[PDB]
Amino acid sequence: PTVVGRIPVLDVRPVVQRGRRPAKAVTGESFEVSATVFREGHDAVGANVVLRDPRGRPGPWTPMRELAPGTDRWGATVTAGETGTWSYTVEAWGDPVTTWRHHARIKIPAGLDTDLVLEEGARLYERAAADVPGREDRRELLAAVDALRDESRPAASRLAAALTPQVDAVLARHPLRDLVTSSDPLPLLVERERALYGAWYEFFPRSEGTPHTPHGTFRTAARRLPAIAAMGFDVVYLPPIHPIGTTHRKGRNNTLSATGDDVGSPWAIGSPEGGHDSIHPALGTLDDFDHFVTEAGKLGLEIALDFALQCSPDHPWVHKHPEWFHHRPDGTIAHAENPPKKYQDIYPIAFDADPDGLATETVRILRHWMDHGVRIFRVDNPHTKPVAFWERVIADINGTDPDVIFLAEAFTRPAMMATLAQIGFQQSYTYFTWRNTKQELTEYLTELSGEAASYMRPNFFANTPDILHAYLQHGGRPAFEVRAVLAATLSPTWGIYSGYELCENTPLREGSEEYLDSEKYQLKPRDWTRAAREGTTIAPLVTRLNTIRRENPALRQLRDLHFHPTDKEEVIAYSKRQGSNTVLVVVNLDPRHTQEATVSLDMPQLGLDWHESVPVRDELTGETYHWGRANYVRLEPGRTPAHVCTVLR
Amino acid sequence: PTVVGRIPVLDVRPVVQRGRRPAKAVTGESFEVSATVFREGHDAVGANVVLRDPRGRPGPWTPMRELAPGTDRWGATVTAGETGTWSYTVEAWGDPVTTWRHHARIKIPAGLDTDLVLEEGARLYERAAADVPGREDRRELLAAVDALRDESRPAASRLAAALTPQVDAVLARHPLRDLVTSSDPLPLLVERERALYGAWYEFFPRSEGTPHTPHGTFRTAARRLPAIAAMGFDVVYLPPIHPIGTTHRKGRNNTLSATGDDVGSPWAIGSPEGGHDSIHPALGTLDDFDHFVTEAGKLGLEIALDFALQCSPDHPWVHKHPEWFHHRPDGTIAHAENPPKKYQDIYPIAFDADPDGLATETVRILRHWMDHGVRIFRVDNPHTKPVAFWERVIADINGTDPDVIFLAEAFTRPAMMATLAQIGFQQSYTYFTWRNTKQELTEYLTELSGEAASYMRPNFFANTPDILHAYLQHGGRPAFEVRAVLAATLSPTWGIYSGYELCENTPLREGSEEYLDSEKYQLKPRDWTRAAREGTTIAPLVTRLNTIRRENPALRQLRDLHFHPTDKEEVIAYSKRQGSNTVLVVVNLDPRHTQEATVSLDMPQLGLDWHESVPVRDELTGETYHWGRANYVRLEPGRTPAHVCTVLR
Ligand SMILES: O=P(O)(O)C[C@H]1O[C@H](CO)[C@@H](O[C@H]2O[C@H](CO)[C@@H](O)[C@H](O)[C@H]2O)[C@H](O)[C@H]1O
Ligand SMILES: O=P(O)(O)C[C@H]1O[C@H](CO)[C@@H](O[C@H]2O[C@H](CO)[C@@H](O)[C@H](O)[C@H]2O)[C@H](O)[C@H]1O
């Protein structure tokens, strides 16, 4: 047996780890399948993609085209349907009709043995006719055959009968394929919509309390949910909801020693009151949690729980499972670190003494929360636990519950970030917060929307409790408006951490990305009613952005994204498209000065001719413009951070 | 089971067709094996390459290094030994000693947990000693352990004992490797030296005749062999040596009809006198051929025969195997073409009626010539026969006779060129003749010496009977001198077609790459003696270039090649290295005007400091220079095309 087939079909993409892991999509998402296809000699080839669903059923006829002249790289767009494990192959073939037509169009006017050429054509169309299932399509081809063979008619007339639109239409649907050769199947994992698309909001239930009871409960925190839903969010991410250790508990502002009624960090999980399968006693009971989840569901909100595989020194595991920790020669366990960050309040887990025990307990814990309606987990620092551990855990959970979504909170080097996505994480945190200039944004999004989209789905949090970027610190409210527009329109999944909409931007100290008086170490009551009344919140802009996203399919996908040139460094422009929906975004990255610029649209990339002028509506204002190949914009901080335009129909 | 191992080792390279075809090397050739290696958490990893020979025996300890900071890409150089099918794996591991040393060097001078730190070190070195086979090496590590544990000595002294050169040497060779994780093996095909390295000379035996008998024989043509050997060539490539058809025979200058004693094209193979297993009667007998092969062998010349799988209309196959041809409805067979070239004197082979019979006959013909000492075949236009046909034929031949070298004459699109190399062709013709500017040469050789080197071995013919480039037509002798220097120093395999030495450069017409009065269609006697006496040959430069190649290992490999910047567009500079051998070449690509330039050498690429100045000898003249980071050159066409310098030791 040979490695190459009769008609070479090579290097089918997308491909992940040479086929050992699946490429990814979600229901309704389109993407390109491509291959290198050519044959020996000089005759034409054709190619098509065969996408098979989880029951092996092939999709519609999906012909490919050569993507660029002389490259022999062919491609076609496919669209994923129901969730599950699909497969795709590329079929390559000789295209004898295209070949014959090319020669015949030349030879017949030249008078070069025309009877012979026309008979060859007749014999080809006879072959084409035999395969065609449709009775009417068959009679149409056979009529062309008889016209080709009518020696009483002019050569040019015999040939023309073989080239009619009626005949073209038949062959376009049912081409004559020679020597059909197939690639080996590649796997496609199709997952639910929310894996790619959704708006996330992070908040601490304990901060949403009452005058008489400052520490929030699930019942008081449930009253915060309506405002979150009203802002258009789909997912609420909660920090760990478990009992918190007392040994080495951190104080306010990340001080080493807690005093008085300091509440400590939620990530310091575990006490004699319970571990990762238990609820902080001040938050209430599992029944109260069920109420919170029910209320969330009523509002169209899904819960994402933080899963942080680490222990306070008071966690029951410490003495129940000593081999789940690395001990020094004096028996002590070194506290966790993420250099230069130190986490004196927790121990990290060790995995090589009892990997089966840890995996078994991990999926038991996850299934407990799954049984109470949690179908999304935000996984804390997965890159400090073994990659194969997550591959195993995610495979186990999704094996029974393929709807569960895992988000990788891995801010680390690119190889690890990519690998975590490839081995199963549905979503990844990204470098978004550290990409703020036009060049940074353009280069990074070109990366994420390109080949990486075959295995990684970005979740653009504009802030987190650990990341208050200098851009926001220096820029104030207009900078918050800018990053919200960017996050919401560049990724189909974005998020903010509570307080973002209040433009909280006071750092721990100059040069830090930590918040002053961080919510991680103290209750952080916020007077939401007062903020709304006084208009000191960008909640309405957030709400508008999520509405625009919900109304425009272009913003609910990742892979179609194009950057358009402008003549100002501070002004970025880009378009996204999905079917007939086109969104055009122009953002002023300068939060302190008005910028005016000319935006020169790459019109063919919009499916428009260079001279055309198209009506657009700025969905942030309702204003309508007519935009073409060159457009004046004037963007004023605090007033017009950006244009978010839809192309009108 | 997980796809990713305990310590991730991913994307091992080289890889060809995702591991379905072998990467290539030849005996004594070095190349880099690389992989992406990293672990969870913040501690160190190491990695090493395990190269296994055809009997499965592993090579020497071969540790890898990270190739660039922050990339997690690791690499090491390996060297291929005896011919055969080898395999290689990458092993990755936690490197606890490197991590412990890093921390210890900090904590001990800071008085931080010193007794605990030193004991942790002692325990590591004990574990290291466990896997050390040599007793003196074990004792060296145990002495470090005992010193680490000596609480009566100062901490700094205890630490220093673990960091001695003697300890380091043991640990370098026998590191403590945690959690060793291996890639799946990848295949490597190691072939003989001549597959990569050799100088080729093409000539027509029939042109070397006598006054009485103008059509040369093998007996008369053998008289040229000493001159070819004296020029330093290793391989003689002969056009087809079989009978030539009379039907539709081509006349002089590729005219359609032969007249009188016209000899026709050797590629129009076959007559009643015999086919591909026969000798042209005017060349003599098989016994005469054996004599020619024997005489060539005595002079260090291997014979490469043309294998052109096509037929004149008079070939025995036309009536013996009609199904090896495509017949039109009137029974006629269309002549072969390579558009826009037409080959009215031959039929192309059709492969889909009897592919088994064609394969069987093809390997029968090859084995006939192999039995008569031909171990190299120049395969005519392999891209107009099925790719899998060659895959099958080459596998069959190399299965019994792995020394046989096949050269693909496929001037076509990149996908097909690459695929032919990948499915078994030992060597490939290239785009060399159409790369003449500094940018063209730099870009193309960067490609050939890069990733492509894992499956393709280039044969740089500076001309062929079909390719007289305009550069040579317009440039005259200085252009011939330049292209010879380039071909000879940029590829370990190069060649010329007879007459190149005489700077024959008259085209069929302006705009053509054909020779006027081409030797393909007529006997072409040459006055070799007169050219030697009148010095109107560049045979001495050709001789010198092959001598320089034979004396400098850097020129007998492909992958190590670096271009150095110059300040003149017409002047190119590059270096090649193999062990302690360094060759620096500077070429003036302008064949008409003197060019002066400053050559700015990338000194670290030469293994030198930027301030350093090194002695070089121009091997074309024997002159010595001292070259550093900035060197002046003045190259006058006709007087000197280039400097070909060795770095003196
Ligand atoms: O930068 P990262 O390490 O990825 C931030 C996340 O991980 C840490 C550790 O779980 C969290 O850090 C908080 O909680 C720890 C443990 O209780 C504290 O010591 C630390 O000061 C605090 O910042 C962080 O919340 C995660 O998002
Ligand atoms: O450009 P290419 O097609 O790769 C040139 C080589 O292939 C042709 C065909 O075998 C050779 O062409 C010569 O011989 C044919 C057949 O006899 C003639 O019709 C043609 O005029 C002549 O050039 C060529 O020698 C090969 O190198």
Side-chain angles (χ1 to χ4, degrees):
Chain A
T2 55
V3 167
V4 179
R6 181 59 186 83
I7 304 293
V9 44
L10 306 164
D11 193 27
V12 177
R13 297 183 189 198
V15 60
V16 181
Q17 292 186 23
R18 303 187 190 157
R20 295 163 60 93
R21 287 286 308 165
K24 300 183 189 179
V26 302
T27 297
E29 185 187 2
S30 290
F31 66 95
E32 175 171 86
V33 170
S34 56
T36 293
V37 175
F38 60 89
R39 70 170 301 165
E40 85 290 353
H42 319 290
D43 295 353
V45 297
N48 60 279
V49 181
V50 179
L51 179 63
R52 293 182 186 278
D53 75 9
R55 273 150 314 274
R57 295 176 305 198
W61 173 243
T62 305
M64 304 167 89
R65 72 195 185 283
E66 189 180 28
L67 301 175
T71 66
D72 300 308
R73 193 73 188 167
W74 289 64
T77 300
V78 297
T79 306
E82 67 174 313
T83 62
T85 294
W86 295 53
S87 72
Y88 50 99
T89 64
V90 169
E91 295 177 339
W93 32 278
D95 185 357
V97 176
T98 296
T99 305
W100 176 81
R101 286 182 175 197
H102 172 261
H103 290 146
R105 288 175 190 272
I106 300 171
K107 290 186 177 80
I108 295 307
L112 295 174
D113 44 50
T114 61
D115 276 343
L116 198 51
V117 173
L118 293 168
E119 176 59 21
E120 286 167 321
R123 292 187 190 197
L124 265 186
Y125 278 46
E126 276 179 325
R127 287 185 53 212
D131 295 325
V132 163
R135 185 213 334 129
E136 304 137 358
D137 290 340
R138 174 180 288 100
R139 178 226 49 105
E140 178 85 47
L141 291 179
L142 287 180
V145 171
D146 288 348
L148 279 165
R149 289 213 171 100
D150 190 346
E151 295 173 43
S152 75
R153 292 289 174 85
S157 174
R158 297 164 64 182
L159 174 59
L163 305 179
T164 64
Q166 289 84 2
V167 172
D168 279 358
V170 177
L171 300 176
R173 283 185 280 109
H174 297 88
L176 178 59
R177 310 188 303 158
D178 283 349
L179 306 161
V180 174
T181 305
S182 180
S183 66
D184 289 333
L186 285 167
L188 173 71
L189 174 63
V190 178
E191 306 188 271
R192 65 189 172 99
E193 177 187 38
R194 182 72 66 235
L196 183 65
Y197 161 73
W200 293 48
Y201 190 83
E202 178 179 3
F203 82 106
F204 292 65
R206 66 186 188 181
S207 291
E208 314 301 331
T210 75
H212 293 87
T213 309
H215 193 297
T217 66
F218 278 116
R219 295 202 166 253
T220 64
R223 301 197 173 96
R224 175 63 182 150
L225 295 177
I228 295 165
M231 278 190 292
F233 290 100
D234 305 295
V235 178
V236 294
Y237 154 44
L238 311 181
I241 57 169
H242 319 297
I244 292 169
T246 52
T247 304
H248 289 127
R249 182 180 284 197
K250 290 191 160 182
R252 297 178 309 272
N253 275 295
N254 198 21
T255 47
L256 198 82
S257 302
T259 59
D261 57 350
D262 273 344
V263 292
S265 171
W267 287 266
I269 296 154
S271 77
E273 314 159 298
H276 292 69
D277 58 356
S278 302
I279 291 169
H280 199 297
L283 289 178
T285 68
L286 190 55
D287 282 355
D288 298 326
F289 178 71
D290 288 345
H291 167 85
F292 180 91
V293 174
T294 296
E295 290 296 309
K298 289 181 61 188
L299 295 159
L301 298 168
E302 294 157 78
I303 306 312
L305 291 184
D306 207 324
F307 179 65
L309 184 45
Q310 65 202 18
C311 298
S312 85
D314 310 310
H315 194 295
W317 290 353
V318 172
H319 291 323
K320 176 169 186 173
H321 305 290
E323 75 277 15
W324 293 3
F325 308 87
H326 182 99
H327 299 75
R328 309 195 65 181
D330 64 355
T332 62
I333 302 165
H335 64 71
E337 292 181 19
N338 206 336
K341 303 181 183 183
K342 292 182 175 186
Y343 306 144
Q344 292 92 338
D345 49 343
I346 52 165
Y347 300 146
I349 296 294
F351 285 78
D352 298 298
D354 187 22
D356 295 339
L358 277 159
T360 294
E361 178 61 7
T362 291
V363 302
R364 186 194 70 84
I365 290 161
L366 296 174
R367 283 194 170 91
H368 171 69
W369 296 112
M370 284 157 55
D371 284 348
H372 291 271
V374 178
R375 318 302 295 186
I376 308 171
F377 297 94
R378 182 274 198 182
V379 177
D380 190 76
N381 293 307
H383 61 299
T384 60
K385 297 71 158 171
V387 177
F389 172 81
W390 298 118
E391 181 179 348
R392 180 181 176 173
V393 166
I394 292 173
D396 181 290
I397 292 295
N398 283 154
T400 53
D401 296 83
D403 68 302
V404 174
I405 294 174
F406 293 91
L407 162 66
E409 190 250 338
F411 301 112
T412 183
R413 299 192 304 274
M416 172 68 83
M417 294 175 71
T419 301
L420 291 166
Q422 292 169 6
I423 56 80
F425 276 95
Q426 281 75 17
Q427 287 186 9
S428 300
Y429 282 79
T430 74
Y431 295 146
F432 179 73
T433 55
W434 305 284
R435 298 293 182 276
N436 294 277
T437 68
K438 183 162 67 186
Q439 186 176 353
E440 288 170 349
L441 286 159
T442 306
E443 288 176 2
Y444 191 49
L445 265 294
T446 298
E447 176 188 326
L448 292 175
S449 62
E451 275 195 343
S454 311
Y455 57 80
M456 177 182 284
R457 312 187 183 95
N459 182 333
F460 281 179
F461 269 86
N463 70 322
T464 76
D466 315 286
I467 310 169
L468 167 65
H469 196 269
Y471 181 82
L472 296 175
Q473 299 180 27
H474 295 156
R477 176 160 174 164
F480 281 80
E481 292 166 347
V482 166
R483 298 303 291 181
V485 173
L486 288 167
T489 58
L490 283 168
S491 179
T493 289
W494 76 298
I496 59 176
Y497 150 59
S498 194
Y500 185 92
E501 65 275 53
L502 307 183
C503 303
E504 290 174 357
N505 78 331
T506 305
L508 179 60
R509 64 182 67 91
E510 188 60 33
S512 175
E513 288 182 345
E514 294 282 321
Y515 285 91
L516 180 64
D517 302 331
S518 165
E519 187 163 20
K520 294 182 288 176
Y521 319 101
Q522 71 182 67
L523 306 179
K524 198 101 181 157
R526 295 173 172 106
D527 192 341
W528 299 112
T529 289
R530 174 181 184 182
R533 176 175 66 248
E534 294 181 2
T536 51
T537 169
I538 62 165
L541 170 63
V542 175
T543 303
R544 176 60 55 86
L545 289 170
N546 283 327
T547 292
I548 294 166
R549 288 162 43 92
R550 288 173 170 187
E551 292 181 344
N552 292 279
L555 296 184
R556 308 203 291 275
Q557 56 80 44
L558 172 64
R559 303 174 205 237
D560 188 279
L561 170 66
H562 186 89
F563 292 93
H564 299 265
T566 87
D567 60 351
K568 289 288 174 62
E569 195 180 344
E570 297 298 329
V571 179
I572 190 171
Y574 49 93
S575 63
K576 295 178 67 166
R577 303 172 60 187
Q578 165 78 27
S580 57
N581 183 240
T582 296
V583 175
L584 316 168
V585 190
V586 180
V587 183
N588 177 11
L589 306 176
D590 193 336
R592 285 183 178 266
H593 307 105
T594 296
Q595 296 282 333
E596 62 188 342
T598 305
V599 176
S600 303
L601 298 178
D602 191 311
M603 302 295 291
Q605 208 70 50
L606 302 176
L608 304 184
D609 224 331
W610 283 100
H611 62 269
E612 294 196 48
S613 173
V614 72
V616 298
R617 179 176 60 234
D618 180 4
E619 302 291 358
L620 295 184
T621 65
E623 281 309 315
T624 288
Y625 310 106
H626 287 271
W627 279 359
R629 60 149 58 226
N631 313 287
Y632 176 83
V633 298
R634 178 180 187 273
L635 296 172
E636 182 176 3
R639 218 143 307 261
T640 45
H643 294 304
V644 177
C645 294
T646 54
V647 170
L648 302 183
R649 306 272 290 170
Chain B
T2 55
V3 169
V4 176
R6 177 65 184 83
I7 302 297
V9 42
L10 310 160
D11 196 22
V12 179
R13 292 184 194 195
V15 62
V16 179
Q17 292 185 28
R18 305 188 188 152
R20 307 227 307 176
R21 284 293 303 167
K24 299 187 185 175
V26 302
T27 295
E29 186 189 6
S30 292
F31 65 96
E32 179 170 75
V33 169
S34 58
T36 292
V37 173
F38 60 90
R39 69 168 301 165
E40 86 291 353
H42 320 296
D43 299 351
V45 295
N48 57 282
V49 181
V50 178
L51 181 60
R52 291 177 186 281
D53 74 8
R55 304 187 56 159
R57 290 131 65 211
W61 171 243
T62 307
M64 304 163 82
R65 68 199 185 284
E66 191 179 26
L67 300 177
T71 65
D72 299 312
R73 193 72 188 169
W74 289 64
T77 303
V78 300
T79 307
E82 68 170 314
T83 60
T85 300
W86 296 52
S87 72
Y88 51 97
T89 60
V90 169
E91 297 179 333
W93 33 278
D95 183 3
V97 172
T98 292
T99 295
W100 173 82
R101 288 187 172 195
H102 177 268
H103 289 129
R105 289 180 185 265
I106 293 175
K107 290 169 182 170
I108 296 314
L112 282 154
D113 284 338
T114 65
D115 274 348
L116 209 43
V117 169
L118 295 167
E119 175 60 22
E120 285 175 317
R123 290 184 193 191
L124 290 181
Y125 279 45
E126 283 180 328
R127 290 173 47 210
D131 298 319
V132 171
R135 181 198 51 270
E136 289 310 297
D137 287 340
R138 277 200 308 280
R139 290 178 172 170
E140 188 74 44
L141 288 179
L142 287 177
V145 169
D146 293 342
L148 280 170
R149 289 211 170 103
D150 188 352
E151 298 159 21
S152 77
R153 289 221 324 229
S157 178
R158 296 168 66 183
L159 177 56
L163 303 174
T164 65
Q166 301 72 37
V167 170
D168 282 6
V170 180
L171 291 180
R173 175 56 179 84
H174 300 285
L176 176 61
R177 310 187 302 158
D178 281 354
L179 305 171
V180 174
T181 304
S182 173
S183 64
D184 291 336
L186 284 166
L188 174 73
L189 174 62
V190 180
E191 312 189 85
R192 63 183 172 108
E193 181 193 31
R194 183 70 66 235
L196 182 68
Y197 162 75
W200 292 48
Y201 188 85
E202 179 180 0
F203 88 104
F204 293 68
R206 66 183 186 183
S207 287
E208 296 296 336
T210 65
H212 185 202
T213 310
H215 193 296
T217 63
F218 281 121
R219 292 301 180 133
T220 65
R223 91 199 169 201
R224 270 302 280 171
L225 294 174
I228 296 166
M231 274 187 296
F233 289 102
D234 307 294
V235 177
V236 174
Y237 156 45
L238 307 180
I241 58 170
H242 318 295
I244 293 170
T246 51
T247 304
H248 295 299
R249 179 179 289 195
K250 297 276 188 89
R252 306 177 58 254
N253 274 301
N254 197 23
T255 49
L256 282 203
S257 301
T259 59
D261 289 333
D262 276 343
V263 289
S265 169
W267 285 269
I269 297 160
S271 82
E273 310 153 303
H276 294 70
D277 55 3
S278 292
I279 302 278
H280 195 300
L283 287 179
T285 70
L286 190 55
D287 278 339
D288 296 325
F289 181 73
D290 287 342
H291 169 78
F292 184 96
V293 172
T294 296
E295 291 301 310
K298 292 177 180 173
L299 295 163
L301 296 171
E302 301 158 74
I303 303 307
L305 291 190
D306 209 315
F307 179 60
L309 184 48
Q310 65 202 20
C311 303
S312 84
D314 305 314
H315 193 295
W317 290 352
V318 172
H319 71 264
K320 290 286 187 182
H321 306 287
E323 75 272 17
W324 292 0
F325 309 87
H326 176 76
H327 305 248
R328 306 180 78 180
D330 65 350
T332 61
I333 301 165
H335 63 76
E337 291 184 19
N338 205 338
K341 302 176 186 190
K342 294 184 183 185
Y343 304 142
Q344 290 93 337
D345 49 345
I346 54 166
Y347 297 148
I349 299 293
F351 285 81
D352 292 299
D354 183 24
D356 293 345
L358 277 159
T360 297
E361 175 67 356
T362 289
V363 297
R364 186 192 70 83
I365 290 159
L366 298 173
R367 286 192 166 94
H368 168 68
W369 295 114
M370 286 157 54
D371 280 339
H372 287 266
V374 180
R375 317 301 296 184
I376 305 174
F377 296 94
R378 183 275 198 182
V379 178
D380 190 76
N381 289 312
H383 59 296
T384 60
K385 299 75 163 165
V387 175
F389 176 80
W390 299 119
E391 189 181 343
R392 175 184 178 171
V393 164
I394 294 175
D396 184 290
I397 292 295
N398 282 151
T400 56
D401 296 84
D403 70 299
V404 176
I405 295 169
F406 294 91
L407 164 61
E409 188 248 343
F411 301 114
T412 182
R413 303 194 301 278
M416 168 68 81
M417 287 173 78
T419 300
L420 289 170
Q422 291 169 7
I423 57 79
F425 276 96
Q426 282 74 21
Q427 285 185 13
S428 303
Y429 281 79
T430 78
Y431 293 147
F432 179 72
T433 55
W434 304 283
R435 299 294 180 274
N436 294 279
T437 70
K438 179 164 63 180
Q439 183 175 0
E440 288 166 353
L441 286 158
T442 302
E443 285 177 358
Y444 192 47
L445 265 294
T446 294
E447 180 188 332
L448 291 180
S449 64
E451 292 208 311
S454 75
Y455 57 81
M456 178 180 288
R457 307 185 186 96
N459 183 331
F460 280 178
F461 266 87
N463 70 322
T464 81
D466 312 286
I467 307 166
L468 169 64
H469 195 273
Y471 180 83
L472 298 174
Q473 297 174 27
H474 296 150
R477 176 165 174 166
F480 283 78
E481 290 172 0
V482 163
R483 299 303 293 179
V485 171
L486 290 167
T489 57
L490 286 168
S491 178
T493 293
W494 78 296
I496 62 179
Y497 150 55
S498 61
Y500 187 92
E501 316 95 298
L502 305 182
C503 303
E504 293 173 358
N505 76 336
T506 307
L508 176 69
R509 70 181 66 88
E510 182 60 32
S512 178
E513 288 179 352
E514 293 282 318
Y515 290 87
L516 181 59
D517 302 333
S518 166
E519 192 166 13
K520 296 182 294 179
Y521 319 99
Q522 77 181 67
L523 306 177
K524 193 174 278 295
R526 289 170 173 106
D527 198 342
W528 299 110
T529 303
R530 178 179 158 189
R533 158 178 84 242
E534 298 185 355
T536 50
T537 172
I538 59 163
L541 169 64
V542 171
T543 306
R544 183 69 194 147
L545 288 169
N546 284 326
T547 292
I548 295 166
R549 291 160 43 91
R550 285 172 172 190
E551 292 178 346
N552 291 278
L555 298 185
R556 305 203 293 273
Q557 56 81 45
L558 168 68
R559 301 174 209 239
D560 187 294
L561 168 67
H562 188 261
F563 293 90
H564 303 261
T566 84
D567 66 336
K568 285 287 183 63
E569 184 192 271
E570 293 301 324
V571 178
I572 188 169
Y574 50 91
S575 64
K576 297 177 63 164
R577 298 174 55 193
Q578 165 75 25
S580 56
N581 186 236
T582 299
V583 171
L584 314 173
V585 185
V586 180
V587 189
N588 178 9
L589 306 176
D590 189 341
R592 283 184 181 270
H593 306 106
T594 298
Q595 296 285 339
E596 63 187 344
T598 301
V599 177
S600 308
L601 298 179
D602 192 310
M603 303 293 298
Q605 201 67 55
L606 307 179
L608 309 175
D609 289 310
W610 286 101
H611 60 86
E612 190 163 0
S613 177
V614 289
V616 299
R617 178 172 57 230
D618 187 352
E619 300 293 352
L620 295 185
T621 68
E623 289 296 320
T624 292
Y625 308 98
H626 297 270
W627 277 0
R629 59 181 299 164
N631 312 292
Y632 175 80
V633 296
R634 181 176 197 269
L635 296 168
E636 177 186 358
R639 177 179 299 274
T640 181
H643 301 297
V644 178
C645 301
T646 59
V647 170
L648 297 178
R649 279 199 95 58

